[PDB]
Design a protein around this ligand. Structure first.
Ligand code: CDL
Ligand code: CDL
Ligand code: PC1
Ligand code: PC1
Ligand code: 3PE
Ligand code: 3PE
Ligand code: ADP
Lengths: 124, 46, 102, 505, 178, 67, 115, 175, 134, 132
């Protein structure tokens, strides 16, 4: 309540006190005020958006791969599944094989790019 | 890290070389053993 | 989420559904009960939100009034001989003398 | 080269994986409730129970994969976060990285997420043991009791909140929420008629432990009016208060551990509970008790000697190990093995936050997987030969070779073979105890690794070998692909977890 | 209650204990209505001995309502009966009564086994017939069923909304001395 | 949400973790402090006034309150 | 106590397997249930139902010295731990103490601030 | 607000700073905080929460660093066991290696022990040793990337600083 | 000699425009007084948005391939393996030739920000960038 | 932090660790637990004064952080136990450099208040070592 600018004069303090209590420059004051002295709010928002997109991509790919692998490889016993897969067109067999692997692999690739720092620019 | 062993003189080393002894040194991995070699990767492809 | 009216409407919907399941009657039975329950629950929970906010505000004011009571009870709860002791003489004379202006 | 993206990757993955599990559970519950009037199984192919089983098993599995990814994210984040504080030596700058919350989903229970290695190990154990247990409960869920297919999803959500909150009250509540689903599983899913009394014993024992923990947390909250471990760090308890708190938390979490003499409930329940819950009860919930004790005791300065608690734990180990010879019931023998392992793990947490909790965490994971494997083997034996007693079934290796091989390799893994992670945990705990107390370390190793092991192997070797002469018309078949793959996954984890990063161990 | 230079600082609320007592009484009344609403929904003459908790073995609503009401009475968390006991122990610790906490714990554990003992009797060899017959069919009262639904909601998830009840009861109790 | 929009702490924590505490302190901490600092604020104002006169009061020196 | 070598007639009254009402049976491997041996089932459900007959029977049943040693084992373990505590204190080694050297920080727990 | 627990001991408390006499049985929460709960619970109570977190991390790294010292001396002993025959191994080992082995022994390094029982002074000395190592490796910018996280601009500035430092040190007279 | 060559390379990079956004990013990272704080914030925002490597590109490429396979295996009757393989190769080649969702509405904002400072002929720009060279 | 430069060194920045006395540790810990209110007050005052008069067009911009000068002086008096003056400008010459570093790191390079506490405690430790 008493911590205010009312009643304060520069003539009531010495020049050393004025100098050591003086405000910094405008850029420093703005960086301190916005809490962006190291990382900016826009950098934080970009990182959050990338993290959310990465999670949604990974979860969707994992779900699609898990559902495709089970719904294609759980149609019967061994002989029944062999007959069903043999009585398929080539694109359908490719989908039965390619689809479960591609989604899970892409999710793992996204995770690997997440844990890695190849984007660092200090390289030669 | 320090040398950890009692030092010997260069005169002593010259005398040992005179007596037919040879200083032990590590030898590089052969192309078969080296995992960064064309021989290694050709073996892998085969 | 943010609307107590919508929260009450959802509560009434799910309450009607669970009462239908519990009674073993099929859902879609007495269909007018769904909007009725939604309206009743929405109004009741809206009023309860308003009443809890009012009660919290008046409770803060009652606590402001009660802090005086607790101080004057602590001064009146002093054991005999402690009223004029150095640890309570100032407060006791503030309440007995200074706070005697009726 | 650790940037801001990985921090938000880990935090977002944790929060949104909790929300993934919760949304799957909510959708499945809505479908289960609003598609039927009675919500019991319609005994036909076109039933929601097939969809319920599919949805729950797939939620568990996919959320487990997401949890693996989030655990790796957390490992990288924690390593680099500890590095950043350690890295900079200049006194002018300090690590001040302030993060923003996500926009799509709120903070559940208005609590910022705090993640520790023990908590995420506990969560991984939750996922895997729940997966195995639910795979072991399909033959038990039927007409009028299919509603417990959601039980493991409820456990996963409760523990997900449990291991991610810094609120001490939310921590205690999530520890307290594990009783109702467990009692409901034991009371309604168990086929044995003696399991009602076992459920009552489990409830009363675990609730006495919960009451002791409740008294301790009430002391903590009332004395220092807060709910944060940092606020606890900014407060000191007197010697009497600290002694009361440590005694109460140890006794409660040892009621749940269990510890000597509070394992009667565990024996009765394990003998009478369904095999899936027995996998989940021994594998996981006791580890939640361990995590609770570790979180409570580490945050409070205790100035008393822990010799009494160490003696209680060692007495539990000895008492459990000496009773293994006299068990003709394989499930009760596995229960005593669980008691022994649990007391050994609980011993490691009697030295505060020293370099002894590492062995405790590793042994918690190892015992989770070993107990899951052993109870699953008992389940296979009881489903094949319709018995568990040693006097009724023997010669399994000759009629069911895969089951006998699984039993033998389970014994090999349980004997602390160096290649697996039980040997690592034994090495940690026993080295620490030998430097602490050499004679007590030798006593513990002698009773546990010789006498208990001898009895345990005697009761299993007699079942594996012999002649299955009687009831040749009723002799079962070999192991199915589900059981074979579950056993192989248990073996694979016990082997390959020795190669996990040593930063956290 | 501290004093600094004849200025009193008051960090304790005197009216909090009465609010806790009121909350305990209200929670007990709510759980007691829940257990007796299930009874009033059925043939009241079917419940004579303690072994006749098997009679509640019926369609899942009555059975689960009974077992959850019994668990709530015993103080099993997070049910409504647990909240009152937890708050009582918290207030006793705040009032620094370790002996009272000990005796409360003894009473709580004995009463908890007293309540959960009857959960064993609920097991019945077959589904029971405890409903009155009106117009040749069992009379199921939808109004009482809805009341039980509301009580079950506030018994299962009442710990999420207990803060507002606590605020209301503390506000009511704050008038006792002012 | 709407139930827990009245305090930045979860409802369970509000219900159990605040035992015997003033709801003014729990919900309006700043007003609670400024109300209990009524005499101290006046003493600080008097100290500042006397300091502007060149009279440094040692007794009320510690009373430098920000909130 | 020991088993009786004499040949005995099969039991007529023995505890047997009992299942919960409305129990879904286990139908693995063709649902083939064999008749159970009475002696085997009696041994299965004997220890679970065994009880002491009179007060204090637990002491003298078997070996009194072994029972006393087993009963005093926790005390013996605590006293051995106290001796080891003496040895560690004389040598300044690891004691049976709750080492609060981390001041409350947990193991690899994330400690970050929100903006 | 922090509270307290009612005390039962009837023992007088005399405070020379405030010139007051109190009874332990009759103390409020603040009096208990300033009299009964005033003790320390960590090695360096004079440090902030952030400072003591850094101190604890450096102490753990120092314990692991002493264990690393012992492991390195063991590895060098293994190397001596292979590169030197037994006819002269013990002499060369007793030259310098045996003394360092006995220096890095059970009390001096934690090893496999649960807790390295250090006084606060010993913990501070270990942390100061770790800080000396950190200073001498950071002056040359060796922390990045194994022991430090730095942005690209920070790395470039550190490289320029290390280049100037290396030039200055190379152009100094020998001792 | 070598340092002179490094400074000459820095000047040559200053002359070019392709490396100009990168050099101005290095200037902004230094938090110097040459660039205004608002300019710093806006340039950081635009540079962060432009240099994002989102997972949506890989997700869309995965969805297009699997979508094509599903479409040709679902509706086409008696498909020809030759045409199916040719279509797979064509779509994979198109993915190879397609730039990774390159954006053009963020680079011009960068030049708007850094055109206020004559980086090529700024005495302060060289002084700031002499120390910081990647 | 607790490092002293080696006066005769073969390289530029060789340092040697030291451990403060138990008396110094006890004094600093007790005062920080007794005067931590002033430090948080200084942080909040700095933020509020940047919020109010941070803009150059404001009327109070020329006054700088002077409203927080009272908080700084109160913190100095509390940490020095009212034995080394009523203002931090009256600091003994041993703590003068540390006081200058604290003022720089607090009001010119607006670092997080952890570093500012480090420098202020350095002032207090210098004063204590001078006048133990
Ligand atoms: C957070 C924690 C705190 C709680 C916060 C919320 C408050 C509680 C709200 C619970 C219910 C919300 C959902 C309602 C769903 C719905 O739509 O129901 C319709 C449903 C009607 O069913 P129906 O089948 O459509 O009706 C046809 C029948 O033939 C029957 O019809 P009828 O012909 O026989 O009679 C018709 C009559 C039927 O309704 C009644 O007769 C209502 C009787 C309720 C019990 C007595 C309370 C009221 C006392 C008298 C008030 C008089 C006011 C002045 C009147 C002046 C003129 C006379 O009216 C109606 O059907 C129309 C709606 C009328 C208003 C309904 C709500 C009444 C007030 C409820 C709150 C009571 C006070 C709580 C505390 C408040 C503190 C500020 O109403 C009811 O079932 C009864 C009323 C609502 C429930 C009351 C009991 C609550 C039980 C929960 C207790 C929670 C405890 C919390 C603490 C512990 C845990 C933390
Ligand atoms: C902001 C982000 C938030 C993200 C999410 C965060 C978490 C959300 C809040 C969760 C709070 C849970 C607290 C524990 C409660 C446990 C009580 C209990 O056992 O209730 C049994 C009760 C169901 O009983 P039941 O076995 O179905 O009983 C059969 C019926 O009696 C007879 O069956 P019937 O066929 O005869 O009749 C059917 C009828 C029977 O009617 C009733 O049961 C009447 C009462 C409900 C009426 C319907 C709703 C009306 C509105 O309806 C039901 O049975 C359905 C009951 C409701 C199930 C809801 C499941 C999803 C969770 C929804 C939470 C909503 C909060 C508000 O609820 C559950 O079992 C819910 C699952 C467990 C909780 C959710 C999963 C875990 C989520 C994370 C937990 C983190 C905990 C942290 C600490 C919390 C405490 C401080
Ligand atoms: C104005 C109203 C707008 C919404 C109307 C929605 C009607 C259809 C709801 C979905 C449906 O068909 O459900 C079938 C089911 C039928 O339930 P049931 O229990 O009869 O079905 C079981 C029988 N078998 C298994 C054969 C299906 O109904 C529901 O699930 C709920 C119906 C009521 C939904 C009320 C929604 C809100 C209405 C607000 C009005 C204001
Ligand atoms: C009498 C019937 C009740 C059952 C017990 C039968 C006797 C068992 C026994 O110990 O026999 C003594 C001994 C065996 O005792 P043991 O030497 O095995 O003693 C067992 C106890 N330990 C090992 C600790 C010393 O002889 C026989 O069992 C053979 C004769 C049996 C009766 C034939 C008629
Ligand atoms: C094939 C199998 C069958 C089809 C499955 C389709 C699944 C679709 C998505 C299911 C969503 C389930 C939750 C329903 C409620 C909901 O949408 O909650 C998400 C929430 C809503 O937003 P709100 O809370 O209003 O806040 C505004 C902030 N933007 O926030 C958002 O909407 C923002 C985030 C985007 C939506 C996230 C959805 C998560 C789904 C998790 C897996 C669910 C699996 C269920 C079983 C299949
Ligand atoms: C049942 C519910 C819990 C009841 C707990 C009752 C505890 C009463 C303790 C009374 C008391 O004053 O004990 C003091 C005694 C010694 O404490 P001391 O070290 O002298 O304290 C000086 C600094 N405070 O303190 C002790 O000796 C510690 C007492 C611990 C008692 C067992 C704790 C609960 C175990 C279940
Ligand atoms: N369960 C048992 N308890 C005690 N003694 C046993 C038991 N089983 C076998 N024996 C002893 O082992 C011997 C083996 O007898 P057995 O071969 O089973 O009978 P038989 O000789 O009539 O075929 C018996 O004489 C008996 O004394």
């Amino acid at each position: 309540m008493n911590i205010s600018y009312t009643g304060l004069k520069l003539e009531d303090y010495s020049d050393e006190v004025i100098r050591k209590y003086k405000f910094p420059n405008s850029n420093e004051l703005e960086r301190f005020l916005n809490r962006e002295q190291t990382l900016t709010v826009q950098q934080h928002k970009s990182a959050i958006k990338l993290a959310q997109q990465d999670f949604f991509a990974v979860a969707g790919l994992l779900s699609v791969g898990s559902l495709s692998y089970i719904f294609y490889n759980s149609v019967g016993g061994k002989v029944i599944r062999d007959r069903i897969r043999a009585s398929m067109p080539f694109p359908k067999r490719v989908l039965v094989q390619v689809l479960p692997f591609v989604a899970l692999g892409t999710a793992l690739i996204i995770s690997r790019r997440g844990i890695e720092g190849h984007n660092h620019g200090y390289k030669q | 890290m320090q040398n950890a062993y009692p030092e010997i003189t260069d005169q002593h080393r010259e005398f040992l070389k005179k007596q037919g002894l040879k200083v032990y040194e590590p030898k590089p991995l052969p192309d078969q053993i080296n995992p960064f070699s064309k021989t290694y990767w050709i073996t892998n492809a085969f | 989420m943010s609307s107590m009216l919508i929260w009450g409407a959802c509560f009434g919907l799910f309450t009607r559904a669970a009462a239908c399941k519990a009674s073993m009657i099929p859902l879609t039975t007495s269909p007018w009960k769904y909007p009725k329950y939604m309206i009743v629950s929405a109004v009741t929970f809206y009023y309860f939100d308003w009443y809890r906010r009012m009660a919290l505000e008046q409770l803060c004011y009652n606590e402001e009034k009660l802090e005086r009571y607790q101080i004057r009870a602590k001064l009146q709860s002093l054991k005999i001989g402690e009223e004029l002791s150095d640890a309570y003489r100032e407060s006791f004379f503030e309440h007995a003398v200074q706070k005697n202006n009726i | 080269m650790f940037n801001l993206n990985t921090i938000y990757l880990s935090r977002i993955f944790i929060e949104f994986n909790f929300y993934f599990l919760f949304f799957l559970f909510l959708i499945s519950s809505i479908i289960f409730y609003f598609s039927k009037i009675i919500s019991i199984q319609n005994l036909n192919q076109n039933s929601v129970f097939n969809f319920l089983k599919l949805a729950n098993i797939f939620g568990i599995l996919i959320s487990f994969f997401i949890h693996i990814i989030s655990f790796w994210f957390y490992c990288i984040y924690s390593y680099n976060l500890s590095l950043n504080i350690f890295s900079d030596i200049n006194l002018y700058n300090s690590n001040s990285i302030e993060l923003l919350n996500n926009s799509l989903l709120p903070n559940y229970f208005k609590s910022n997420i705090t993640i520790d290695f023990f908590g995420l190990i506990l969560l991984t154990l939750a996922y895997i043991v729940g997966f195995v247990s639910i795979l072991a409960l399909d033959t038990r869920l039927y007409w009028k009791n299919i509603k417990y297919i959601f039980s493991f999803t409820i456990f996963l959500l409760i523990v997900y909140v449990y291991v991610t909150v810094s609120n001490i009250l939310l921590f205690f509540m999530c520890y307290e929420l594990l009783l109702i689903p467990s009692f409901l599983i034991v009371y309604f899913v168990s086929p044995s008629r003696r399991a009602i009394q076992a459920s009552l014993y489990f409830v009363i024992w675990t609730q006495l432990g919960s009451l002791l923990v409740l008294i301790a947390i009430s002391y903590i909250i009332s004395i220092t009016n807060t709910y944060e471990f940092n606020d606890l760090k900014y407060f000191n308890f007197t010697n009497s208060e600290s002694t009361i708190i440590i005694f109460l938390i140890f006794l409660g979490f040892g009621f749940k551990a269990p510890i000597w003499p509070f394992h009667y409930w565990l024996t009765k329940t394990h003998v009478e509970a369904p095999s899936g819950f027995s996998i989940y009860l021994s594998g996981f919930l006791v580890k939640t008790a361990l995590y609770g004790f570790y979180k409570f005791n580490t945050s409070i300065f205790i100035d008393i000697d822990s010799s009494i608690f160490i003696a209680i734990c060692i007495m539990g180990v000895v008492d459990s190990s000496l009773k293994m010879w006299g068990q003709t019931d394989l499930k009760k023998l596995v229960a005593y093995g669980t008691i022994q392992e649990m007391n050994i793990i609980y011993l490691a947490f009697c030295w505060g936050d020293s370099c002894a909790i590492l062995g405790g965490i590793l042994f918690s994971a190892t015992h989770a997987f070993l107990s899951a494997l052993m109870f699953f083997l008992v389940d296979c034996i009881y489903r094949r030969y319709h018995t568990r007693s040693l006097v009724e079934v023997n010669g399994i290796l000759h009629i069911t070779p895969n089951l006998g091989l699984s039993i033998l390799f389970m014994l090999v893994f349980f004997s602390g073979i160096p290649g697996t992670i039980k040997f690592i945990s034994e090495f940690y705990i026993f080295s620490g105890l030998l430097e602490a107390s050499p004679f007590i370390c030798f006593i513990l190793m002698l009773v546990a690794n010789v006498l208990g092991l001898i009895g345990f192997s005697k009761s299993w070797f007699n079942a594996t070998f012999g002649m299955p002469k009687k009831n040749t018309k009723y002799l079962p078949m070999d192991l199915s692909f589900k059981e074979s793959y579950i056993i192989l996954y248990c073996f694979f984890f016990l082997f390959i977890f020795s190669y996990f990063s040593s930063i956290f161990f | 209650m501290s004093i600094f230079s004849n200025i009193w600082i008051n960090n304790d609320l005197n009216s909090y204990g009465l609010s806790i007592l009121l909350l305990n009484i209200i929670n007990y009344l709510i759980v007691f209505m829940l257990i007796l609403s299930v009874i009033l929904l059925t043939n009241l003459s079917k419940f004579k001995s303690l072994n006749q908790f098997k009679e509640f073995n019926s369609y899942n609503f009555i059975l689960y309502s009974l077992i959850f009401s019994l668990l709530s009475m015993a103080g099993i968390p997070p049910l409504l009966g647990f909240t009152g006991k937890f708050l009582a122990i918290l207030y006793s610790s705040f009032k620094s009564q370790y002996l009272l906490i000990l005796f409360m714990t003894i009473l709580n554990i004995f009463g908890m086994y007293f309540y959960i003992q009857n959960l064993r009797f609920v097991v019945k060899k077959n589904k029971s017939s405890i409903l009155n017959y009106k117009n040749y069919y069992v009379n199921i009262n939808y109004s009482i069923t809805l009341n039980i639904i509301l009580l079950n909601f506030f018994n299962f998830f009442g710990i999420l909304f207990l803060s507002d009840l606590i605020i209301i009861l503390n506000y009511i109790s704050s008038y006792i001395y002012i | 949400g709407v139930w827990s929009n009245i305090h930045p702490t979860d409802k369970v924590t509000l219900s159990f973790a605040n035992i015997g505490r003033p709801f003014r302190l729990i919900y309006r901490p700043e007003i609670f402090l400024r109300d209990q600092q009524a005499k101290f604020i006046q003493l600080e104002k008097e100290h500042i006034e006397k300091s502007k006169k060149g009279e440094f009061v040692e007794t009320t020196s510690p009373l430098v309150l920000w909130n | 106590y020991m088993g009786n070598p004499a040949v005995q007639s099969p039991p007529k009254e023995f505890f047997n397997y009992h299942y919960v009402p409305d129990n879904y049976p286990d139908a693995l491997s063709g649902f083939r249930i064999a008749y159970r041996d009475p002696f085997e089932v009696q041994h299965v459900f004997a220890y679970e139902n065994w009880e002491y007959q009179y007060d204090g029977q637990w002491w003298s049943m078997g070996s009194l010295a072994c029972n006393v040693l087993f009963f005093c084992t926790p005390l013996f373990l605590y006293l051995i731990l106290q001796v080891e505590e003496l040895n560690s204190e004389k040598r300044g080694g690891t004691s049976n103490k709750f080492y609060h050297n981390n001041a409350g920080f947990f193991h690899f727990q994330i400690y970050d601030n929100k903006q | 607000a922090f509270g307290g627990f009612r005390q039962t001991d009837n023992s007088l408390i005399i405070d020379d700073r405030r010139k007051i006499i109190l009874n332990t049985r009759s103390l409020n929460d603040f009096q208990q905080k300033i009299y009964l709960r005033n003790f320390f619970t960590n090695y360096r109570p004079d440090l902030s929460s952030y400072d003591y977190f850094a101190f604890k991390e450096k102490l753990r790294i120092g314990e692991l660093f002493l264990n690393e010292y012992r492991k390195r001396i063991n590895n060098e002993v293994r190397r001596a066991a292979i590169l030197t025959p037994t006819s002269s191994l013990r002499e060369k080992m007793n030259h310098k290696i045996a003394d360092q082995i006995l220096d890095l022994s059970s009390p001096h390094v934690r090893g496999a022990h649960f807790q390295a029982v250090r006084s606060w002074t010993d913990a501070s000395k270990i942390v100061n040793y770790v800080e000396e190592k950190q200073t001498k490796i950071n002056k040359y910018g060796l922390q990045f990337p194994l022991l430090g996280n730095m942005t690209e601009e920070q790395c470039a500035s550190k490289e320029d600083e290390v280049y100037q430092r290396l030039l200055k040190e190379m152009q100094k007279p020998p001792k | 000699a070598s340092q002179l060559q490094r400074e000459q390379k820095l000047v040559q990079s200053l002359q070019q425009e392709s490396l100009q956004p990168h050099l101005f990013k290095i200037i902004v990272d230094s938090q110097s007084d040459l660039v205004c704080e608002a300019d710093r914030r806006e340039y950081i925002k635009h540079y962060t948005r432009a240099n994002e490597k989102s997972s949506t590109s890989q997700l869309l490429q995965v969805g297009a391939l699997l979508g094509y396979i599903y479409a040709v295996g679902r509706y086409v009757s008696n498909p020809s393996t030759r045409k199916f393989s040719y279509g797979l190769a064509a779509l994979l080649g198109s993915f190879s030739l397609l730039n990774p969702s390159k954006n053009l509405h963020h680079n011009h904002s960068l030049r708007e920000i850094y055109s206020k400072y004559n980086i090529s002929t700024n005495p302060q720009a060289l002084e700031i960038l002499k120390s910081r060279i990647y | 932090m607790f490092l002293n430069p080696v006066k005769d060194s073969e390289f530029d920045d060789e340092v040697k660790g030291f451990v403060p006395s138990e008396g110094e540790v006890r004094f600093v810990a007790n005062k920080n637990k007794e005067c931590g209110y002033y430090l948080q007050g200084i942080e909040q005052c700095r933020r509020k004064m940047v919020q109010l008069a941070g803009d150059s067009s404001s009327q109070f911009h020329s006054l700088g952080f002077l409203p927080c000068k009272r908080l700084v002086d109160a913190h100095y008096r509390c940490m020095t136990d009212d034995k080394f003056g009523s203002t931090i400008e009256e600091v003994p010459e041993i703590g003068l450099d540390s006081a200058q570093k604290f003022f720089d790191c607090t009001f010119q390079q607006l670092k997080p208040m952890q570093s500012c506490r480090r420098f202020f405690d350095q002032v207090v430790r210098d004063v204590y070592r001078a006048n133990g």
